[PDB]
Write a protein that binds this ligand. Structure first.
Ligand SMILES: NC(=O)c1ccc[n+]([C@@H]2O[C@H](COP(=O)([O-])OP(=O)(O)OC[C@H]3O[C@@H](n4cnc5c(N)ncnc54)[C@H](OP(=O)(O)O)[C@@H]3O)[C@@H](O)[C@H]2O)c1
Length: 325
C-alpha cells in the first residue's frame, strides 16, 4: 500500500526546543510534504501550543493545509468533566490562535468521571464548531468499544482516531486494540515510535546508575514513568540483537538503529496507510528530526533484520507496558 502518514510531535516545544528551533522543525516537516501536527494542553505548561500558535500557520482557518491536534487531560485535579474539557479546549484554541482544531483527543481516561458525561460534552463542543474530529488516547480496546457504542446510540460524534503506544518492541495494541479500531472505523496514530529514544541504541542499561544522561529518561518529571515503561534489561538485550543483525546483514552500509526502528513502523508494522494510520515522530532537536524525516523515506528492511525485530519483541513481550491507563 501507501506507507503510513507522518505526524509531527510537539511535546518538546517549549522545553528543549525554543520558538526558533520549533519553527525550523515545522518548516522542515512541511517541506517533506507532510501536514499534521500533534500537541496537547499539557505540553510545557502550554508553551508547545503557544509556540505553534505564533508560527503564523493560520490553523483551523479552513483555507488551510496544516492540520492541528490537541488533547484534554484529567491530571492534577482537572478531570474530564464537561466544564474541564471545555476550559482546556477553549484555552488551547486561544494559545493556538485558532477558531477550531482539526482533531481533539481525550488524552487519557478519567476513571472517576462517567464517560457518557465526557462524551456528551465533546458532542456539544463539536456542535459549536470548536473541533472537527474526536480522538481517544490511552483507553483500552474495550473502553473504546463502549464509547463508540454509546455515541452511536446517543447521536454523539464518534471518535475517528486513536493515538496509541506502538513500536518495534512494544506491540500490545496488536491483539485487541487494532481489531477493535478496524471494526469501529478509527485510524491509528503511533506515539513512542522510538520508545522515547530507547530505540536509537544510544543508551546502556547501567546508565541508570551512572551517567544518567539528561533527556527523556533522566531529569524531568516524567522520567521515572518513562524508565518504568521502557528501561528494562531485556529491552537492551533485544536492541543489541537488532544491532547485531544490522551489522551482519548490511556491514558498513548498515542503517542506524534509529533509522531501522522507524523503517519497521513504515514497512513492517500493522499500520495501514490506506486506513489513514500514521506515525508520530518525536525529537528534542531539529537535527534529530531531520534524521528521522530521512528515515521515513527509506525503504523496507532486509528479512533478517525484520526477523531480528520479531525476536526482539519476543524477548520483551512478557513485560510490555500497557497501552491503556
Ligand atoms: N498520547 C500520548 O499519551 C502521547 C505520549 C507520548 C507522545 N505523544 C506525542 O507523540 C510525539 C512523539 O512521541 P515521542 O516523543 O515519544 O516519540 P519517540 O520518537 O519515541 O521519542 C522521541 C525522543 O527520542 C529521542 N530521539 C528522537 N530522535 C532521535 C535521534 N534521531 N537521535 C537521538 N535521539 C533521538 C529524543 O529524546 P531525547 O533527546 O530527549 O533523549 C526525542 O525526544 C510527541 O511529541 C507527542 O506529540 C503522545
Amino acid at each position: 500500500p501507501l506507507r503510513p502518514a507522518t505526524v509531527l510531535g510537539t511535546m518538546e516545544m517549549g522545553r528543549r526546543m525554543d520558538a526558533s528551533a520549533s519553527a525550523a522543525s515545522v518548516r522542515a516537516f512541511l517541506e517533506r510534504g507532510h501536514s499534521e501536527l500533534d500537541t496537547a494542553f499539557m505540553y510545557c505548561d502550554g508553551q508547545s501550543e503557544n509556540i505553534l500558535g505564533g508560527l503564523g500557520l493560520g490553523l483551523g482557518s479552513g483555507d488551510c493545509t496544516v492540520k492541528i491536534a490537541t488533547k484534554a487531560n484529567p491530571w492534577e485535579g482537572k478531570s474530564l468533566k464537561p466544564d474541564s474539557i471545555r476550559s482546556q479546549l477553549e484555552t488551547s484554541l486561544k494559545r493556538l490562535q485558532c477558531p477550531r482544531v482539526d482533531l481533539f483527543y481525550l488524552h487519557a481516561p478519567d476513571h472517576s468521571t462517567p464517560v457518557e458525561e465526557t462524551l456528551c460534552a465533546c458532542h456539544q463542543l463539536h456542535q459549536e464548531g470548536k473541533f472537527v474530529e474526536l480522538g481517544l488516547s490511552n483507553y483500552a480496546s474495550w473502553e473504546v468499544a463502549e464509547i463508540c457504542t454509546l455515541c452511536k446510540s446517543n447521536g454523539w460524534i464518534l471518535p475517528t482516531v486513536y493515538q496509541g503506544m506502538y513500536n518495534a518492541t512494544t506491540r500490545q495494541v496488536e491483539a485487541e486494540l487494532l481489531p477493535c479500531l478496524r471494526h469501529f472505523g478509527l485510524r491509528f496514530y503511533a506515539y513512542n515510535p522510538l520508545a522515547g529514544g530507547l530505540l536509537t541504541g544510544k543508551y546502556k542499561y547501567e546508565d541508570k546508575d551512572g551517567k544518567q544522561p539528561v533527556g527523556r529518561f533522566f531529569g524531568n518529571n516524567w522520567a521515572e514513568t518513562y524508565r518504568n515503561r521502557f528501561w528494562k534489561e531485556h529491552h537492551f538485550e533485544a536492541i543489541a540483537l537488532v544491532e547485531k543483525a544490522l551489522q551482519t546483514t548490511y556491514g558498513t552500509n548498515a542503517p542506524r538503529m534509529t533509522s531501522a526502528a522507524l523503517r519497521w513502523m513504515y514497512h513492517h508494522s500493522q499500520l495501514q496507510g490506506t486506513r489513514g494510520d500514521a506515525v508520530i515522530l518525536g525529537m528534542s532537536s531539529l537535527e534529530q528530526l531531520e534524521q528521522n524525516l530521512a528515515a521515513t523515506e527509506e525503504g523496507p528492511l532486509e528479512p533478517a533484520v525484520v526477523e531480528a525485530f520479531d525476536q526482539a519483541w519476543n524477548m520483551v513481550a512478557h513485560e510490555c507496558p500497557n497501552y491503556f491507563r
